[PDB]
């Protein structure tokens, strides 16, 4: 049909990313799939002058024996030329679910000058072969672009829908469609099904209630009786947190601390003591006011580990300036736990802000890299840089 | 020239073709590039071209090593910092390991096939160059350019096209691209592989590439890349431990490079001594005499040498078994088999990521080391057996902030098993003193012992206080700190360090009975 024009930022380059070593069996998934796809004129092999490339990875479906290619676009969507804003309304809602219309993309064609960027390669177990190069015909599943060129089709697609039930809300985000309402369960899976038929009258699983989501506020420990040590502890847990709510004050408890005590001397709270802690609590009982997201700056994700399959994360944009914090735990291994960890969190900042968020990954990268994929499920890849958590700030949540 | 797919060659984006000035040269060397030129005009490899080309590109005749006659070559370097960037790929070499057991391989030499390749109609303009009369003659070429930049790309892809319907029709053979060289194994018997050879090496030829006649042809086992490989066995290629008398410290080098080298099938080879040598070398000329462990290391490597070990070949049937020991503080050894200890490959880790660590996590990198180099070589993960048991793991494990994972392993009883030494309390500790310290100490029991350092550094000083505390305190000792520095080391587990103020720490650490670390602002 017509191949609308699509560019890069003036003067960037097509990427040139090292595709992360595949599984046998992997390969033969992206081998197989690949190959249909060529068949179907979807992509097509290409030749050594085209020096750029993107990894690709193949992950497993949601209850179902069938891998789903996953391109890792992300260096090229940071390199592609900018271009629906955000339901508000959709994070009150009881019942928001996802489809993948991803597939939705390969009806339209990718402007003939712009493919050679979409190059990505199988590749070849012990650099034995060649690898297998391809470039996108069509637009591309996890590309920036994508979107945004389907949203006229789209929009045309929307609206027999949106206007027949405007009590529900469609969000697109990439590849995916979230679709929320306050249908009671029953109606609302109805609901859901119909507009997948009506989608499959055009040739176009995931399921939260973002209305039971909170923010997990810093707590601070209800003793009996309270020895040298634990006040020790609650001083230091509030000399951190004092700097988000400034209204905290330790000073009484200080005075308790006066001598070198034996650590596990119990020492009984003076009324000011008590009083001041009572005031303390009452500070963190909420978030700090003032806390306003920002659209012109990145949403940073910091998770920590706290054991046993329990994770804590906050999702921030200015240091202590939390938009939101939440924990998490096991639904296994420490891996897999951060996979499904840091796919919620991205999940819920789409939702909220319709953003991905930056994460700071507890774990190696040799580790990450190697793992991930393994129990990756969703359409895109949020950003992410590996750290060392400081000690103190995983005995400060929870 | 070739009937095959001519691959679309362009320049660097605003770039113009290659202007540079041919250097004049002897007469007899115009002599001699006159008639290499014109053989080739004759067999199309080049062809004259009129004024209408600006571009140029210098040529000069030099003699082949040893022999006594003309070689023409261009300098296409000008030509090839003006051509555009191909995927020219990974720098990636094959493991042997990785290899099957075929009951036969041959080696083709596909050098000049080169030539046979042609090169882009709209871009061999570019590749201009002139012999200079003692009525020019100007000349371009029609084919790959030997030493210019999209050669080896362009031709590895061509090839690919050309062996890919061979490959779809002899699903039984398996030809494996490499540089000037076509290795091809298969298991078919010895008669029926020379015929395959021979259906190859012409199929080829009806594409245009020139090949060597199997009476002309390397026999194995192939010298390839440090290695030996032969059909069914490979190793490292013989390996000559000199009996000098003098050692250089260059001469070290290549010594334990050399070991190194080794030691990815040659188990037991070890390089510390040796690399101590190395200790405040002033020059690459100057001799350090062995020391006596070093002799005897250079002994014992030389003796392990001496008995030609074969790795075995990869058999997609049989399970990749990864174990892994500890060969001394930080030196893991490991080996990968299919058969009951008869390995694929070997090899050492001694990557020591942190200024302090434990054999847990030390053995958890090296777990993950060896995951990564098998989906490398063998796109599966080996099933790991360690000298850990599963109850030291999960300790380490759920207490520690970072998150990891060990793929299926076993336990092995093979010591030195790995285990932690010493573990924190979680709680203080009733009936042990308590020590603040922040360079001094006081307890409750009312001892203080305060002294002062000398080239100590701020975080030097903190550590220096709780090593003090350690030392004059009972088998209980509750310590409480300021340093979230030394609290975070000391919580870390650390049963290795590069300080030595940090082992003599975990040496009391390790002797007492119950520790409790605590901090405070
Ligand atoms: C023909 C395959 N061949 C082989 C393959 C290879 N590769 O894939 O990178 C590299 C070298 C190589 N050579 C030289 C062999 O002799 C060999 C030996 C055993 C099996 N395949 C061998």
């Not at chain 1, 177990?125 to 006229?152: C, D, H, M």
């Not at chain 2, 001094?440 to 975080?459: A, I, M």
Request: one cysteine or more.
């Amino acid at each position: 049909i017509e191949t609308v024009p699509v560019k890069l930022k003036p003067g960037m380059d097509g990427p040139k990313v090292k595709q992360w070593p595949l599984t046998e069996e992997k390969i033969k998934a992206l081998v197989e799939i690949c190959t249909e796809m060529e068949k179907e004129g979807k992509i097509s092999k290409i030749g050594p002058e085209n020096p750029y490339n993107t990894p690709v990875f193949a992950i497993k479906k949601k209850n179902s024996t069938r891998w789903r290619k996953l391109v890792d676009f992300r260096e090229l969507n940071k390199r592609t030329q900018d271009f629906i804003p955000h339901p508000a309304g959709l994070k009150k809602k009881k019942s928001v679910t996802v489809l993948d219309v991803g597939d939705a993309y390969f009806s339209v064609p990718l402007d003939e000058d712009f493919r050679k960027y979409t190059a990505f390669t199988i590749p070849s177990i012990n650099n034995e072969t060649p690898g297998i190069r391809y470039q996108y015909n069509v637009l591309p599943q996890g590309w920036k672009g994508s979107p945004a060129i389907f949203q006229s089709s789209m929009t045309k697609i929307l609206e027999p829908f949106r206007k027949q039930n405007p009590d529900i809300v469609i969000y697109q985000y990439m590849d995916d469609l979230y679709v929320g309402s306050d249908l009671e369960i029953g109606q609302h899976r109805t609901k859901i099904e119909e507009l997948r038929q009506h989608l499959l009258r055009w040739g176009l699983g995931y399921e939260l209630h973002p209305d039971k989501w909170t923010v997990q506020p810093i707590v601070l420990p209800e003793k009996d009786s309270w020895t040298v040590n634990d006040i020790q502890k609650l001083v230091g847990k509030l000399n951190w947190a004092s700097q988000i709510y400034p209204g905290i004050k330790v000073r009484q408890l200080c005075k308790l601390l006066r001598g070198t005590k034996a650590l596990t001397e119990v020492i009984p709270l003076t009324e000011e003591a008590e009083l001041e802690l009572a005031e303390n609590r009452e500070i963190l009982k909420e978030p700090v006011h003032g806390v306003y997201y920002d659209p012109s700056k990145d949403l940073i994700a910091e998770i920590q580990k706290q054991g046993q399959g329990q994770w804590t994360y906050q999702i921030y944009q200015e240091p202590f300036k939390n938009l939101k914090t939440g924990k998490y735990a096991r639904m296994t291994n420490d891996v897999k736990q951060l996979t499904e960890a840091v796919q919620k969190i991205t999940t819920e900042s789409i939702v909220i802000w319709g953003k991905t968020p930056k994460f700071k990954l507890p774990i190696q990268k040799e580790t990450w890299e190697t793992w991930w994929t393994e129990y990756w499920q969703a359409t895109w890849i949020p950003e992410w840089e590996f750290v060392n958590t400081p000690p103190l700030v995983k005995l400060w949540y929870q | 020239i070739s009937p095959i797919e001519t691959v679309p060659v362009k320049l660097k984006p605003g770039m113009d073709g290659p202007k540079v000035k041919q250097w004049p040269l002897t007469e007899e060397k115009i002599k001699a590039l006159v008639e290499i030129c014109t053989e080739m005009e004759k067999e199309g490899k080049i062809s004259k071209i009129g004024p209408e080309n600006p571009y140029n590109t210098p040529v000069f005749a030099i003699k082949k090593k040893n022999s006594t006659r003309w070689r023409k070559l261009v300098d296409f370097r000008e030509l090839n910092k003006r051509t555009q960037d191909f995927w020219e790929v990974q720098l990636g070499i094959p493991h042997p390991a990785g290899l099957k057991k075929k009951k036969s391989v041959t080696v083709l030499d596909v050098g000049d096939a080169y030539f046979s390749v042609p090169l882009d109609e709209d871009f061999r303009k570019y590749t201009a160059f002139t012999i200079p009369s003692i009525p020019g003659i100007r000349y371009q070429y029609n084919v790959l350019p030997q030493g210019w930049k999209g050669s080896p790309a362009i031709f590895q892809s061509s090839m690919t096209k050309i062996l890919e319907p061979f490959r779809k029709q002899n699903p039984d053979i398996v030809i494996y691209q490499y540089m000037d060289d076509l290795y091809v194994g298969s298991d078919l018997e010895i008669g029926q592989h020379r015929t395959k050879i021979e259906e190859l090496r012409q199929h080829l030829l009806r594409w245009g590439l020139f090949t060597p006649d199997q009476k002309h042809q390397k026999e194995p086992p192939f010298l390839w890349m440090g290695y030996e490989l032969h059909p069914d066995k490979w190793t490292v290629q013989p390996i000559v431990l000199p009996e000098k008398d003098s050692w250089t410290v260059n001469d070290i080098q290549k010594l334990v490079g050399k070991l190194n080298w080794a030691s990815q099938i040659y188990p037991g080879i070890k390089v510390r001594q040796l690399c101590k040598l190395l200790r405040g070398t002033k020059a690459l000329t100057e001799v350090i005499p062995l020391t006596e462990e070093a002799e005897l290391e250079l002994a014992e490597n030389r003796e392990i040498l001496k008995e030609p070990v074969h790795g075995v070949y990869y058999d997609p049937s049989k399970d990749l078994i990864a174990e892994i020991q500890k060969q001394g503080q930080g030196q893991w050894t490991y080996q990968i088999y299919q058969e009951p200890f008869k390995n694929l490959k070997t090899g050492k880790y001694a990557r020591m990521r942190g200024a302090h660590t434990n054999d847990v996590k030390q053995l958890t990198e090296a777990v993950q080391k060896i995951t990564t180099e098998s989906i490398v070589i063998w796109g599966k993960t080996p099933k790991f057996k360690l000298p850990i048991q599963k109850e030291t793991w999960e300790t380490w494990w759920t207490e520690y902030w970072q998150a990891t994972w060990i793929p299926e392993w076993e336990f092995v009883n093979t010591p030195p098993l790995v285990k932690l030494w010493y573990q924190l309390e979680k709680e203080p500790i009733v009936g042990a003193e308590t020590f603040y310290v922040d360079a001094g100490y006081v307890t409750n029991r009312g001892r203080q012992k305060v002294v002062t350092l000398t080239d100590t550094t701020n975080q030097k000083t903190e550590l220096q206080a709780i090593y003090l505390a350690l030392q004059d305190s009972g088998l209980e000792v509750n310590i409480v700190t300021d340093s979230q520095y030394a609290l975070g080391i000391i919580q870390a587990q650390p049963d290795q360090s590069e300080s030595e103020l940090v082992n003599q720490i975990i040496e009391q650490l390790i002797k007492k009975e119950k520790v409790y670390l605590a901090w405070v602002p």
